[PDB]
Design a protein around this ligand. Structure first.
Ligand SMILES: NS(=O)(=O)c1c(F)c(F)c(S(=O)(=O)CCO)c(NCc2ccccc2)c1F
Ligand SMILES: NS(=O)(=O)c1c(F)c(F)c(S(=O)(=O)CCO)c(NCc2ccccc2)c1F
Ligand SMILES: [Zn+2]
Length: 257
């Protein structure tokens, strides 16, 4: 099936998902000098006070924390968005080395990892239907650099040994995603896509300028995950990032400076 290897990785995805060569694919390189400051963009409103995390899962590509999104508990609005977007899950992409792992790049710089908080537009009723709409999803992207530890990440890191292989899940309640955010909500935004199959062109990307710092030990724990299922040949889950795709006819807007 699709993956990140030589034989099934990003360069092969277009054969099953022809939109891979589409006009609004993600991620992209954010050229900070070319991004246009838009004084009409609003501050992003991240309202995560009543978030209800449920479960953490290794899906063979990444790991994801899923949330109760059956009410307006953890929502994103404002910024470039019209309407209200409910948090459904977050996941990460990361490298085999600290100098790679992010999907977006900033002036061609790669970060060690990228956190994606995936939200869906409530006007479409459910995340599946939202993913079929051009304004269906909003993904808040946060870069991770290696330096000091991020305390709010540790609860995630410490459960990963229990979901080592594809298809493993664990209960993961009372996790507060506010502990994964940087101080500033200054961002770049552009219209794009899922960065994994099926690569739907349904995402308003909101990429925060300020990275979070995580420790080497934290990111080392991500790299102990396996792409393979229990009792198949071991392939460490590393380098689960799609490279930057052509910007084509898009402008990246900045909320700042
Ligand atoms: N992400 S979590 O459920 O594991 C957790 C922590 F473990 C944690 F240590 C923190 S902490 O680093 O801020 C210090 C003790 O509270 C937060 N923080 C959530 C938060 C962040 C900013 C403003 C309000 C809440 C936090 F959410
Ligand atoms: N990077 S990204 O945020 O575009 C991303 C993924 F990398 C990713 F793996 C996923 S997934 O694990 O759910 C695999 C499917 O692409 C989603 N999910 C987007 C989504 C969530 C709910 C309903 C429909 C799409 C997803 F949005
Ligand atoms: Zn992602």
């Amino acid at each position: 099936h699709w993956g990140y290897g030589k034989h099934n990785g990003p360069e092969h995805w277009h054969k099953d998902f022809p939109i891979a060569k589409g006009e609004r694919q993600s991620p992209v390189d954010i050229d900070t000098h070319t991004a246009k400051y838009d004084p009409s963009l609003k501050p992003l409103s991240v309202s995560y006070d009543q978030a209800t995390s449920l479960r953490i899962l290794n899906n063979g590509h990444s790991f994801k924390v899923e949330f109760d999104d059956s009410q307006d508990k953890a929502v994103l609005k404002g910024g470039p968005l019209d309407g209200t977007y409910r948090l459904t899950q977050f996941h990460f992409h990361w490298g085999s080395l600290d100098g790679q792992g992010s999907e977006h790049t900033v002036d061609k710089k790669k970060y060690a990892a990228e956190l994606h908080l995936v939200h869906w537009n409530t006007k479409y009723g459910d995340a599946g239907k939202a993913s079929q709409q051009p304004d269906g999803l909003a993904v808040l992207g946060i870069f991770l650099k290696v330096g000091s530890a991020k305390p709010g990440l540790q609860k995630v890191v410490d459960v990963l040994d229990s979901i080592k292989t594809k298809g493993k899940s664990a209960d993961f309640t009372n996790f507060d995603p506010r502990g994964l955010l940087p101080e500033s909500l200054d961002y770049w935004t552009y219209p794009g896509s899922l960065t994994t199959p099926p690569l739907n062109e349904c995402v308003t990307w909101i990429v925060l300028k300020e990275p979070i710092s995580v420790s080497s030990e934290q990111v080392l724990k991500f790299r102990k995950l396996n792409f393979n299922g229990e009792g198949e040949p071991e392939e460490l889950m590393v380098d689960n990032w799609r490279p930057a795709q052509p910007l084509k006819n898009r402008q990246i807007k900045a909320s700042f400076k």
